[PDB]
Amino acid sequence: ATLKDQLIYNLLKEEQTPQNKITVVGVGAVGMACAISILMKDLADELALVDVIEDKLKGEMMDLQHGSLFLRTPKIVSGKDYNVTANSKLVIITAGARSRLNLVQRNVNIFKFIIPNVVKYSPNCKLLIVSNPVDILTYVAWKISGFPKNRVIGSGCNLDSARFRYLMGERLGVHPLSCHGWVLGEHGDSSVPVWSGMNVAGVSLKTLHPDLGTDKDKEQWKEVHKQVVESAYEVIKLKGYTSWAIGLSVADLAESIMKNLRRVHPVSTMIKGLYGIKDDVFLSVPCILGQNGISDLVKVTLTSEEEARLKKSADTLWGIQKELQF
Amino acid sequence: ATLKDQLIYNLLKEEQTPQNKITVVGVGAVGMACAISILMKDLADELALVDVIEDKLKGEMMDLQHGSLFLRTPKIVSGKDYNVTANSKLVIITAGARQQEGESRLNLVQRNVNIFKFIIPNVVKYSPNCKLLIVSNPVDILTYVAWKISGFPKNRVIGSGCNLDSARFRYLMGERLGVHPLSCHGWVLGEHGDSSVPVWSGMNVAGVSLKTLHPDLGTDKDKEQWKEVHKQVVESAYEVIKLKGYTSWAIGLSVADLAESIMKNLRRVHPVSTMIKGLYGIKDDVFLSVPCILGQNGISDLVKVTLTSEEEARLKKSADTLWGIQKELQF
Amino acid sequence: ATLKDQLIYNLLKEEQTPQNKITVVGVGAVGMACAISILMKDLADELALVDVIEDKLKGEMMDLQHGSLFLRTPKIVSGKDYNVTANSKLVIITAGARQQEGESRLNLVQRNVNIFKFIIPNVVKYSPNCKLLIVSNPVDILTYVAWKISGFPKNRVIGSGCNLDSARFRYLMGERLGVHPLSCHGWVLGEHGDSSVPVWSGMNVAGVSLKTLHPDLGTDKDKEQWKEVHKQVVESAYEVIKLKGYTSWAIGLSVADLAESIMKNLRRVHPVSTMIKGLYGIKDDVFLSVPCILGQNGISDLVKVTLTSEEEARLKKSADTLWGIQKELQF
Amino acid sequence: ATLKDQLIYNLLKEEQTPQNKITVVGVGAVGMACAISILMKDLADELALVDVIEDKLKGEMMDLQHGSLFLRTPKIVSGKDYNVTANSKLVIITAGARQQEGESRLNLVQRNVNIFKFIIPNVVKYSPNCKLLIVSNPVDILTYVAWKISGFPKNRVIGSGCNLDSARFRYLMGERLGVHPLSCHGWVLGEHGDSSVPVWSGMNVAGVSLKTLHPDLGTDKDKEQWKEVHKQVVESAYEVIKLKGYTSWAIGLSVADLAESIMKNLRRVHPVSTMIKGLYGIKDDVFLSVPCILGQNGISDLVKVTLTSEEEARLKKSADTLWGIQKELQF
Ligand SMILES: NC(=O)C1=CN([C@@H]2O[C@H](COP(=O)(O)OP(=O)(O)OC[C@H]3O[C@@H](n4cnc5c(N)ncnc54)[C@H](O)[C@@H]3O)[C@@H](O)[C@H]2O)C=CC1
Ligand SMILES: NC(=O)C1=CN([C@@H]2O[C@H](COP(=O)(O)OP(=O)(O)OC[C@H]3O[C@@H](n4cnc5c(N)ncnc54)[C@H](O)[C@@H]3O)[C@@H](O)[C@H]2O)C=CC1
Ligand SMILES: NC(=O)C1=CN([C@@H]2O[C@H](COP(=O)(O)OP(=O)(O)OC[C@H]3O[C@@H](n4cnc5c(N)ncnc54)[C@H](O)[C@@H]3O)[C@@H](O)[C@H]2O)C=CC1
Ligand SMILES: NC(=O)C1=CN([C@@H]2O[C@H](COP(=O)(O)OP(=O)(O)OC[C@H]3O[C@@H](n4cnc5c(N)ncnc54)[C@H](O)[C@@H]3O)[C@@H](O)[C@H]2O)C=CC1
Ligand SMILES: C[C@@H](Sc1nc(-c2ccc(Cl)c(Cl)c2)c(C#N)c(=O)[nH]1)C(=O)Nc1ccc(S(N)(=O)=O)cc1
Ligand SMILES: C[C@@H](Sc1nc(-c2ccc(Cl)c(Cl)c2)c(C#N)c(=O)[nH]1)C(=O)Nc1ccc(S(N)(=O)=O)cc1
Ligand SMILES: C[C@@H](Sc1nc(-c2ccc(Cl)c(Cl)c2)c(C#N)c(=O)[nH]1)C(=O)Nc1ccc(S(N)(=O)=O)cc1
Structure with a gap:
């Protein structure tokens, strides 16, 4: 048999739904700083990263994964598709752009895609909005998600x-x-x-x-x-x-x-x-x-x-x- | 009497040296990842940052400082001048060119050796008893270079390797x-x-x-x-x-x-x-x-x-x- | 119009089920050492303590609670009744009898079996899906005893061994x-x-x-x-x-x-x-x-x-x- | 050569003093609670314990040592002799008598003063530059006693209060x-x-x-x-x-x-x-x-x-x- 099977006897083949999962959406400077800080504080048992830039997203995921020996978060995943974010307790939104009104509208257009996808895969998560303008976008995420106000939080x-x-x-x-x-x-x-x-x-x-x-x-x-x-x-x-x-x-x-x-x-x-x-x-x-x-x-x-x-x-x-x- | 004086009675002044100071040289992608990791591990009572790009240096310093509430490192400093690094227990060198897609780390030697010729003597001048931890590539070659330039015994010159x-x-x-x-x-x-x-x-x-x-x-x-x-x-x-x-x-x-x-x-x-x-x-x-x-x-x-x-x-x-x-x- | 109401506006009162709860059964030296170590490693969002000695049990709970400012476990409870242990992810058993001079291995093990016959069914009642970690001695035999009594699958009964x-x-x-x-x-x-x-x-x-x-x-x-x-x-x-x-x-x-x-x-x-x-x-x-x-x-x-x-x-x-x-x- | 010599090539023998050493005096319930909490917070690179009860002291030391795999404090020592406390940055005193039946409160106070009369000179001798943290009761009175006996400046004598x-x-x-x-x-x-x-x-x-x-x-x-x-x-x-x-x-x-x-x-x-x-x-x-x-x-x-x-x-x-x-x- 395989070396694995010669080395290891299996009692049962999992697998539980994620128990303490966090998702970060947007792996720019802010998203990755959130990610590393969350990893070094041992807050999650699973971390998922989403972005639209696919090579960046994969490279950031891999970089983190290579540091697994030094962390206590045993599963780090990423994808453009929100299926990777399923059953998150907490979903952090750092996606967007960083006049003004047209900028708000650009980030709103982004949220129109992101928020429904988040809700579909984790209908019971808390949403933490970081993207600017944060107070306005927190309201946008609230209206789009249809969540109760207790579950929609702006970093503010x-x-x-x-x-x-x-x-x-x-x-x-x-x-x-x-x-x-x-x-x-x-x-x-x-x-x-x-x-x-x-x-x-x-x-x-x-x-x-x-x-x-x-x-x-x-x-x-x-x-x-x-x-x-x-x-x-x-x-x-x-x-x-x-x-x-x-x-x-x-x-x-x-x-x-x-x-x-x-x-x-x-x-x-x-x-x-x-x-x-x-x-x-x-x-x-x-x-x-x-x-x-x-x-x-x-x-x-x-x-x-x-x-x-x-x-x-x-x-x-x-x-x-x-x-x-x- | 100022507000500070009204609020706080001072028993004694005069500064003391830090007990566990770490310096990071180079505040690029690697230096700052080292900084945040060290900060979140509570390894230092003072962190010093050095770089030759002065605006980037100040901005990175400030960004870390603004996170102080969430940290246990009460002093974060920076400067192009190596006086900011004095009395460091550990000095981490991350400065220099990095390999581009398809380029060998060994193609970075001339560039980075030349940078070390400036950096290492400065480091040693201000922290003659520190350990040097080399990260810049190619790391094995640059550890040798740091060792040769510094005149340190080899126990104190370490490559991340x-x-x-x-x-x-x-x-x-x-x-x-x-x-x-x-x-x-x-x-x-x-x-x-x-x-x-x-x-x-x-x-x-x-x-x-x-x-x-x-x-x-x-x-x-x-x-x-x-x-x-x-x-x-x-x-x-x-x-x-x-x-x-x-x-x-x-x-x-x-x-x-x-x-x-x-x-x-x-x-x-x-x-x-x-x-x-x-x-x-x-x-x-x-x-x-x-x-x-x-x-x-x-x-x-x-x-x-x-x-x-x-x-x-x-x-x-x-x-x-x-x-x-x-x-x-x-x- | 209580001070609490003047000060705090409540958005909702709902659910509030522990997500990462651990119970320690037995608050002797071993149990409390497990408790303090688990608290200081921020493993649990709720800790529950059980023992048959009521005064000792309440004292230990209070002593831990008074340290809450220094911990990140917001809820510490205790009781002789197992309702306090409901919905535990992990239940740690340190309770048992100590061997007497001249007492045979069988007699000692049997006394512990009799003790586990009271403990385990009550644990299972309130946390049917928990993992059991047996610490009580003789640990290898009592792990077997807990497995037999609980009816748990092999994967959820663990001896500290x-x-x-x-x-x-x-x-x-x-x-x-x-x-x-x-x-x-x-x-x-x-x-x-x-x-x-x-x-x-x-x-x-x-x-x-x-x-x-x-x-x-x-x-x-x-x-x-x-x-x-x-x-x-x-x-x-x-x-x-x-x-x-x-x-x-x-x-x-x-x-x-x-x-x-x-x-x-x-x-x-x-x-x-x-x-x-x-x-x-x-x-x-x-x-x-x-x-x-x-x-x-x-x-x-x-x-x-x-x-x-x-x-x-x-x-x-x-x-x-x-x-x-x-x-x-x-x- | 020995197994050690086959396995390990030594570069340096010369050891150095511990740089962040803490001593706890008195290994009763309070002392050992201070000890475990300090160990689990990675505050010290060496921990020393002192008491007058030799068997208890040794057992507590060994019990801590056996937990070393799970700790980041590479050296734990103990002794009746204060030479084990040398070069401590912080010395925590939890040593005290227990009031006895019929004993007056003032009498108990003087018995603890007598204990400090022996402890403090010894601490000062081996760590003349430490900070003293007094926990022993009556804590406010005994902090004064420690200050008076030690001759330390007020900034280095601290009562848990x-x-x-x-x-x-x-x-x-x-x-x-x-x-x-x-x-x-x-x-x-x-x-x-x-x-x-x-x-x-x-x-x-x-x-x-x-x-x-x-x-x-x-x-x-x-x-x-x-x-x-x-x-x-x-x-x-x-x-x-x-x-x-x-x-x-x-x-x-x-x-x-x-x-x-x-x-x-x-x-x-x-x-x-x-x-x-x-x-x-x-x-x-x-x-x-x-x-x-x-x-x-x-x-x-x-x-x-x-x-x-x-x-x-x-x-x-x-x-x-x-x-x-x-x-x-x-x-
Ligand atoms: N609330 C606060 O205190 C602060 C908020 N911010 C805000 O955080 C946001 C991000 O900042 P940076 O990371 O520096 O920007 P960035 O440009 O470096 O990163 C943004 C990421 O969002 C991604 N993104 C864009 N559209 C997306 C979509 N439809 N789905 C998923 N990902 C998408 C981008 O591809 C990009 O990787 C900005 O809005 C910025 O203003 C920044 C600092 C503080
Ligand atoms: N040992 C290892 O496993 C790894 C090593 N590296 C190496 O680390 C080095 C840095 O990488 P990055 O931070 O991504 O590059 P970066 O380009 O983001 O940052 C480099 C910094 O070095 C600074 N610098 C240049 N000359 C300097 C001088 N004389 N004094 C002070 N600072 C100076 C630059 O101004 C710049 O801020 C590269 O050599 C890279 O290849 C990168 C990853 C892993
Ligand atoms: N597996 C290992 O490596 C080690 C195992 N142990 C074992 O752990 C066990 C406990 O050790 P200690 O705390 O020192 O003993 P202890 O006597 O100080 O504490 C035992 C506690 O169990 C309680 N208890 C008794 N019956 C109970 C019941 N029906 N329900 C709830 N609580 C009950 C007692 O009241 C007592 O508070 C011992 O059997 C000991 O041998 C001890 C050291 C190492
Ligand atoms: N400041 C505060 O908030 C609190 C202070 N305390 C005080 O802390 C002290 C200790 O409490 P416990 O640990 O419960 O007492 P304990 O009696 O269990 O332990 C005291 C230890 O001091 C040792 N000791 C006595 N004379 C000594 C000497 N000459 N040199 C070295 N060690 C000596 C004893 O042998 C004993 O091991 C008490 O005075 C207590 O009142 C207790 C709780 C809170
Ligand atoms: C200090 C700047 S720094 C900064 N500001 C912005 C920003 C903020 C608000 C607007 Cl309306 C615009 Cl157009 C840009 C971006 C971005 N993007 C950025 O990357 N950095 C800032 O964040 N201003 C700010 C003003 C109002 C709001 S609110 N109360 O309308 O939500 C939120 C933020
Ligand atoms: C080192 C002592 S220290 C110690 N040992 C015991 C002990 C252990 C086993 C038996 Cl059979 C008995 Cl009667 C007592 C008690 C207790 N109680 C105690 O408080 N301390 C010990 O734990 N021995 C031990 C022997 C056999 C087993 S096993 N493989 O049968 O599970 C487990 C432990
Ligand atoms: C609440 C008790 S609990 C308690 N109290 C005492 C105690 C406290 C003060 C005196 Cl004077 C005496 Cl004789 C005993 C011991 C002890 N030992 C003990 O183990 N527990 C306590 O700590 N009282 C206390 C009173 C006065 C002072 S002070 N300001 O005079 O220093 C300090 C503490």
Whole structure:
């Protein structure tokens, strides 16, 4: 018989449906950073990669597979066909392009193909949307998939808040893990730094320093949030794109989802009902993440100005959204 | 009183050196895969990055920094100037030209040797007690070059070598046998390149010799053509390069595997590029992979593999080929 | 208008079924060491503890829970009633009675049978599809007992067997050679404890066979007395018990390693106790350790190790002894 | 030659000191919990254990060693003689007496002072530059004793203090809110144990102050009696002890978390016991818990929490009480 059969006696020939499977759709810079970060955190027992560029997709799969000895994810697969994504617990969408409106429409056209395919093979997965513009595309994925809002999550301001805490820790000489602060609302340009919640060891910086984040602030802490916004552009300008930070951010979200941790993360969720907002829009607020996606959200007390900014974002997003062609 | 002063009382200042600093030279596809892997393995308390392309360097540094919340490495720095690398315990060199589709790693010698002539003395100046881990291709030749230029004892000059080839081999073995690569044991030695040598005589699962079970294993007569598995290992980089343009993730993980053994003084055995003079009647100062014990002083010991007459001939051929190249280098 | 409602808006209250649940039955030193190791390796999303000693049980649960901030297992439960164990992927049995001075093997085994007669039906009731991992001694016999009572297929009943014996062997081997145990390979098979069998032919570093280098290895003509390494594997277990009263840490770590392969579907090879009828020469329903492929279905395959005449005879004798005892048991 | 010499060619003999060494003094339930958690977090390249009970010490050491295959800490040692602790970066003291029937609390305190009178000089002798982490109770008093005896600067003497109390508080908060403790923020400061102070103003999720949302929080008029949460923090300490006889897992995990920040120079903030003279009107040499930045040189900075008059008066009362005891201790 074969060497295998001489070496190994078989008790039974499998095979179970995937138990802890994650799919990443789009193997560009962001998708692959998510993939490697998820692999090194041992979050999945099966990883599937999808893309439309077939040679790239195969080469990325093979590169990862060659590192199998150093990982604890025993099955890595890829394909243009969504059959490879069947029974995923979590499906991460990083596909797309990176004026504006026509760009949104290009990514919407992409989602019109991707989302139905995802749902067909994993009708009960959680969807985590990373593609930009992320808040708008999370709404698009929600409408197309027909999923309940708990199962559709935008990476949203998780990255923005990580940047903010990195910058805060640099200023204070404290690890980011111990520097707490929340950036909410729209990802990117219009995000909102919640000054009232910035604290170390529960000590409110705003209470110590009333001018915190105002124009008159002798220390111009507002510049920290300015950097949060601008640093996103600077990284793209410097290396051409961003990958590592978003990959790590996404793996953190995936960790709460896959392990049912119920930690709180600022991610994009359907916010209709809050802050005078009455349109189907997705904005980041702090959400409890677990095996059922977003099960709960924190109602952050916002100032008048902060609420106004979220409202303005909602209006803008809805304005774009009600013109999109599905 | 500033906000910081209101919030935090300082007991004492003055800086201290990092305990476990790693530098990566070259922030291209390979350097950054090494960086992320090392970061996610929590091996370093400081990571330094160096490159000659200043915008790319700063951008890569910043991208990693923005991921700090999710890491356990509190300081990430970068610069074109090697002062950013001072006091490194381990310095990983990934800079230089890579082989294009259909090009041999051996075609990169002039380019990369010349780059090493600038890099290595700079590294040594700022971290005279570091271990050097060479990744740039052709890796065996460049380990020899790094060793010669640095003036380090050879224990502290390590080539990533066949750790990756052996990983690939065990991956493919595991796919054939239906076993995780961790449980499939098999060694690929010699050149990290076309002349590498699969040690059929040592392949096993649970200590059961595959060659004993299957005498034709690895030969031309083999009905299961296991030699094709080694051919796949040889061709793997070329195939991945044809498909995605370069290789990155597997070598990044391989390097982090080696870094872990060194930084944590594990004394695990890995096939890495080192001087093999004195083994198998080889008299030249040739570098290529054999199994080595890796720890805090780098390579402390070599494991002497018993090769068949056929395996030993192939290894000697690999050594002959590589020494033909090394010997013509001028320093 | 409770603080919770002011603070948190609930989107839905649904389902909430554990996806990666593990139960430990028995919270003595072994059970709790398995528990802490499993927690620190992030293997489970829910951990359940069962024992008949209620105060001890609640105390252990609370002590683990108070450490929740430092763990990534969000739900830890306990109870004397098996409803707490519902929907476990893996159920680890460390419960049983300790042998009394002068008590016969049969009397001790029978008491454990009687204990398993209460435990196993309750486990099966609540997790009909779980894998069972038996740790309780005598482990080879009690693995058989759990298989008989549960009615589970062979693949889902696993004895920790010689997993710990082999880890001890590799520690001792590593110490002699100055190599990390990860890189020292060697297999102790058959009966856990006194009658275990060291497979000298498989002992190697980097695929280099120690027996081939040193043909007297393991014999009485061996001037280096490598046989003493296996004698230490056997004696070290008793020595630890005499010194600290019990063993806990090493068994905890070994069980966590098995749980990792099972929970993550790794298909790594481990030396564990499995129903060995029809193989290695044996015709009775007995469980002994051989290298087994472990993953999400428990033991899906096993490795057929080539044994010397002596090694084979030792396994056969163990099988004869085990069946001699088992055939007298009252179920 | 020997088998070892046939198998392995040595390049280097010269060994080097362990570079990230941790010692645990006292191998009771607390000490061994600290040990296993530190081992499973890969914080140390060498672990030393010290106790006065020789058989127990050796057995614990061996049990850990036997688990080496599953660990990344290549050297574990033990001894009654403190030479085994030489060159430790961090030394964790969990050694203590047990109060006896009829014994006064002050008498028990002095018996632990007498224990430290022997331990601390020995630790200082072999690791004059280490950080001391005091866990032994009464922890705040004994941290002062260790500081006084050692002559170390305040940054290198750290009491476990309210690290555990705070972890318990966050666990309980998390249960009430249905949120992971990692995302539930709240600080218990001052004295470890009975007289600890829950800082209501700092309790939050996502930076949303519970005290602002719910002004009655932490008062007797609290319709939800959140004060009961802190009551459970103190009460649960006694309940675990009553139920299982001692506490181990939670303290061990909390100590490993502190060790992680120190060994990896993270500069995270933890509630630990430190010299507070000069704060809150306190003018005596007393150690109480406040949030401290922990890194390579121990406590480099502390956070100056804004406290209510009532909260400030509790710490002052605690300091007066502790000083009154300390001035009467016999050194
Ligand atoms: N939410 C956030 O914080 C961040 C979001 N991003 C976004 O992530 C997206 C990707 O970024 P990059 O990876 O740098 O772009 P990229 O161009 O390198 O990769 C995109 C990949 O999507 C693939 N793709 C295109 N159409 C597809 C389809 N119909 N099905 C499957 N795959 C398809 C492309 O072939 C390409 O490989 C962009 O939208 C970018 O703006 C980037 C950084 C941060
Ligand atoms: N040992 C192994 O198994 C593998 C080795 N490699 C080798 O690694 C090397 C790098 O590959 P990639 O990162 O894909 O190339 P890359 O082109 O993406 O990056 C190379 C980087 O080296 C930098 N560099 C060039 N000269 C420099 C100097 N004097 N100082 C500092 N930096 C300098 C470049 O600016 C560039 O950023 C190649 O030689 C490649 O063949 C690649 C894969 C595997
Ligand atoms: N397979 C191996 O390599 C090793 C196996 N062991 C075995 O593991 C077993 C446990 O060891 P220890 O924890 O030290 O003993 P232990 O006596 O400290 O703990 C046993 C626990 O089982 C509980 N128990 C008894 N009857 C029960 C029932 N009907 N249901 C639930 N729980 C019950 C006891 O109350 C006790 O808490 C022993 O049989 C020991 O020999 C120990 C070391 C190694
Ligand atoms: N700070 C905290 O949050 C907590 C502190 N603790 C304290 O930790 C200490 C230890 O707790 P357990 O491990 O349960 O006590 P234990 O009595 O079980 O173990 C104490 C060990 O200290 C050893 N020891 C006594 N004198 C010694 C000496 N001169 N040199 C070396 N070792 C010596 C004993 O021999 C014994 O092995 C106690 O003081 C306890 O109160 C306990 C729980 C929490
Ligand atoms: C900081 C830039 S960096 C950046 N931005 C974009 C981007 C974002 C939004 C739009 Cl509308 C367009 Cl056209 C491009 C792309 C891309 N692609 C990219 O690769 N990088 C960014 O992400 N801006 C941003 C603005 C609004 C939204 S939202 N609230 O409408 O969802 C999302 C993102
Ligand atoms: C090394 C001791 S340490 C030890 N051994 C025992 C033990 C083991 C077997 C028997 Cl038959 C008895 Cl009566 C006691 C107990 C217990 N209880 C204990 O607490 N510690 C041991 O586990 N021996 C052992 C012998 C035979 C078997 S088997 N092949 O029959 O399953 C399993 C183990
Ligand atoms: C909740 C008990 S649980 C407990 N408490 C004690 C204990 C604590 C304090 C004293 Cl003064 C005495 Cl005599 C015993 C022991 C012990 N041993 C034990 O094993 N468990 C506790 O730890 N109390 C405690 C009180 C005061 C201090 S302080 N601020 O004066 O240092 C520290 C701890």
